[PDB]
Amino acid sequence: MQIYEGKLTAEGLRFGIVASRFNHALVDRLVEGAIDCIVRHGGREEDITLVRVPGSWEIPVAAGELARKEDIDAVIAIGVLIRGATPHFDYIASEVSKGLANLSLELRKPITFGVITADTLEQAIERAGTKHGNKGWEAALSAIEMANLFKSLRW
Amino acid sequence: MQIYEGKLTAEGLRFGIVASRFNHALVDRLVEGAIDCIVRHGGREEDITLVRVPGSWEIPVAAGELARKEDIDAVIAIGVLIRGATPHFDYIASEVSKGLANLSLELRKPITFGVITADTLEQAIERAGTKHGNKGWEAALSAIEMANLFKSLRW
Amino acid sequence: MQIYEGKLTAEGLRFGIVASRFNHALVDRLVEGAIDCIVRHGGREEDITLVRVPGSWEIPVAAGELARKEDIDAVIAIGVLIRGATPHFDYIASEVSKGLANLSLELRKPITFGVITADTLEQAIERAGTKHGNKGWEAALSAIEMANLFKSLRW
Amino acid sequence: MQIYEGKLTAEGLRFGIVASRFNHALVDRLVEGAIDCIVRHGGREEDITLVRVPGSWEIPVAAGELARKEDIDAVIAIGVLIRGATPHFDYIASEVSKGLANLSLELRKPITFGVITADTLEQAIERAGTKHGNKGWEAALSAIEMANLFKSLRW
Amino acid sequence: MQIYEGKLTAEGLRFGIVASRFNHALVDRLVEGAIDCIVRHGGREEDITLVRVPGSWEIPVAAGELARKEDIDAVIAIGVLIRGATPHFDYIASEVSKGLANLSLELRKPITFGVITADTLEQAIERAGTKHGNKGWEAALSAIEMANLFKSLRW
Amino acid sequence: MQIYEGKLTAEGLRFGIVASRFNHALVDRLVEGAIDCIVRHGGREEDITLVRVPGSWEIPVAAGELARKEDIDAVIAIGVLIRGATPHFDYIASEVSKGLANLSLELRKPITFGVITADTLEQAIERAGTKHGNKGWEAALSAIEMANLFKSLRW
Amino acid sequence: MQIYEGKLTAEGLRFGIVASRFNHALVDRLVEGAIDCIVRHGGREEDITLVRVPGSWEIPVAAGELARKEDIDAVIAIGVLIRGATPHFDYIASEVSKGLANLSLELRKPITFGVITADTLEQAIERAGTKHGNKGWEAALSAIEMANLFKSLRW
């Protein structure tokens, strides 16, 4: 059986992060998590490009610019959506997930989904570096594993 | 680390607004908010193009015409959907969000989502320049930040 | 400020695993998790020593034999305790935690605590490679980080 | 991968049993279970030493005398604690578990925990050779497996 | 099978009693019980040493002085703890049980636990020479049996 | 009367911090608190050594390495434990408190306990630099006072 | 960025305390806290001036006399108001807070607010050196930090 799997060494890999500014008190924790993950897996901080966008809505069109760069191995898309009073949350979370998902297929490139989609502020705090982990850290770790996997499937 | 971020100066930027006419008592407040935001951030009012369309359904096909113009840096899409008696609201809000989201990826251009999707008239009044802000103002401010970011990612 | 931290590369590190046989349907998943973690972080499988013991009670006296080996950098102690009808669970979980904790101080060596202490079978299934992760994987990852940290604090 | 595990043959192994006299109607069943297990796994009954102590409190200081004997391969500590009216049970079960646990680490020798710690008399009857097995039999079987494991880790 | 057990003759045995002064209305009954037990089993009253300490907290450090005497065969530690309004009871009962338990292992000498740990005054009265016996009498009887057992295990 | 007390000047004192990485969104606030406290009491930031460990479990074995350094006056041990679904929290909080407590006695050196042990995430947020203070700040301040006290008791 | 902050060394600083006599059983604890704080931060007790006034009402007119002294660096205003049966508490707490607040602006001098304003006696006991700290200690520590800050802003 041919088995392809990605190792978790980030040496030589070059990453893009697109992180939204809305809910920055939490998104700042997720971006810390993502960069920590890359650096402690052997990535260089100088091989990370961080793009800040005003909100989750803007993440896919910015991810599209980064993912089109030849020298980016994977993109980590980071944000925090918290459900409010209106149905707005439903529409943003629907479109950001679909947009990133489509780009990843179109450009044949890993784009990881480190976007918290929380019903409550408490849930969001749990997943941005407290008792349910850091989904920025998890998204970066997926991107490291996917970048290597792609490396090994091409050659 | 390479950091790309958009400043909030609108000097030299050229904007399209597409605003629906349904619920105009509120949409008029959102368009006021968007233009105020551009002008007080250093944009010229003569560098704004405003397109009026009959409803939220019509916003993406009109945004598509504006976003294809070489001399438009970002498009701000503005409307008000208020849930009624039938499931109609669900289908319009689904399609307008998907349509704008797709265009923004396809044409590689910021299209901001200043469309209120409110369960109630009271909620819509709150978000069209009363106690929960003006999402026309917020959408314009996202468009200013995204236009500059794109400027800096191309060069 | 002097900062010491452990990287997550397992290259050149040599690990002991002590895993209990009681609840083996779950412990087998935790040991899979631990070995996967070591190997995908750059450890060699031939640099892992696995010791099987009959139950959680027996883990500390076996961990003590492995941790006394000069050529073991860290020990990963793995088991599953599930609360039953009697107070027995309380006493085993108390003694295994205290025993491992004491050894780690006495022998000045990382011994990680990959022992699930679950009130219910459902909780144990969640933490042995389903919806709350794999604490074998987490324990191994702590051991990789602690082995390196110790490396850097000695020299 | 180096794998160390203990087989279940008791040939040539020499065992100590320390069994308390309180609750002897049940402890007698556990000691029967322990001796049956050793003999049917190929141990000689003449290679078993049985020490009787007045209660569970006295088991660790007696286990300490047996475990210090060069010609004892493992010690099986057996008793029955049943919760009564006062908090006494909590303190005895806490100290007997801690005492045995410490000795096993200190003397680097298997000491198995065949001590029932039951909330009710019915629970104790279940675990002393009726519908939930015999924890004397289980403790002896752990001691056989641990004695062999230690054999294989030393040489 | 080698069987070691302690007979209940106290002839020639030399005992230490450490008894606390708090709750002396009951502790006086337990010390009476302990001395009666030794004397009616053939011990001489002149071969008993009684040490009084102010409370249960002080029993282990005093038991430590008695147990270090070459001419003391066993120590009987006696007191009464009755749960009050505060969590204090929990901490004293925890430390006195652990302290005595540790000494007995360290000095390789029987130290029996005749300390009542009662939720209520009524429970304490029951166990200090009324309807649930005398735990001073029981503690002395354990000490007689353990002293002899140790006699027979050394030679 | 001889009175020994520690002043709160940190001039010339050299500190170790051991801080866990689990719950880093809060632990980062506690470490900020600890360093702020040292620096504003007259400590030099270059006389602080910070050791990061993967979790609270790992804090005592790392604190043991720092506290054995001749040039460390006190160690500040920092983490956040938040009770979850299983009894795991009980066992980690029990062992980290016991481990640090033992080291401090063994090495005759202040090791302060800045470990939050919270039933809820809200409680943990309160004690990591909001409405119930910063226990990192408090732990550092204890370490400053204890380091000086030790200074004055030796000479 | 220019950053001004006050260190917590009290060396060379000269303090006024104004403390009310009503509720003196608690206010005596707050004044102890304030003086302890100054002295253990390196202040001389001979550089403290303590003014006693009959009640909280009288604190601002007395603070005004102390704050007008050239040789006072900060004033610490201390009292205890406990809500009673009538609306009197509301009016005293309103006027003492406003009076001190105004003086501090008028004379351009730190006046710290160590006045407990408790609904209940139990709350007041908590904040005058039991489980919620000592607000005399906290007020003094604010005064030390503010005196230094003012030092650094003038030169």
Curated annotation (Swiss-Prot), chains A, B, C, D, E, F, G:
Its EC number is 2.5.1.78. It comes from the Bacteria. GO terms for molecular function: 6,7-dimethyl-8-ribityllumazine synthase activity. The active site is at H88. Keywords: Riboflavin biosynthesis, Transferase. (2S)-2-hydroxy-3-oxobutyl phosphate binds at A85, T86, R127. It catalyses: (2S)-2-hydroxy-3-oxobutyl phosphate + 5-amino-6-(D-ribitylamino)uracil = 6,7-dimethyl-8-(1-D-ribityl)lumazine + phosphate + 2 H2O + H(+). Transmembrane segments: none annotated. Pathway: Cofactor biosynthesis; riboflavin biosynthesis; riboflavin from 2-hydroxy-3-oxobutyl phosphate and 5-amino-6-(D-ribitylamino)uracil: step 1/2. GO terms for cellular component: cytoplasm; cytosol; riboflavin synthase complex. GO terms for biological process: riboflavin biosynthetic process. Pfam families: DMRL_synthase. HAMAP family: Lumazine_synth (MF_00178). Forms an icosahedral capsid composed of 60 subunits, arranged as a dodecamer of pentamers. This is 6,7-dimethyl-8-ribityllumazine synthase. It comes from Aquifex aeolicus (strain VF5). The lineage of its organism: Bacteria, Pseudomonadati, Aquificota, Aquificia, Aquificales. The gene is ribH.
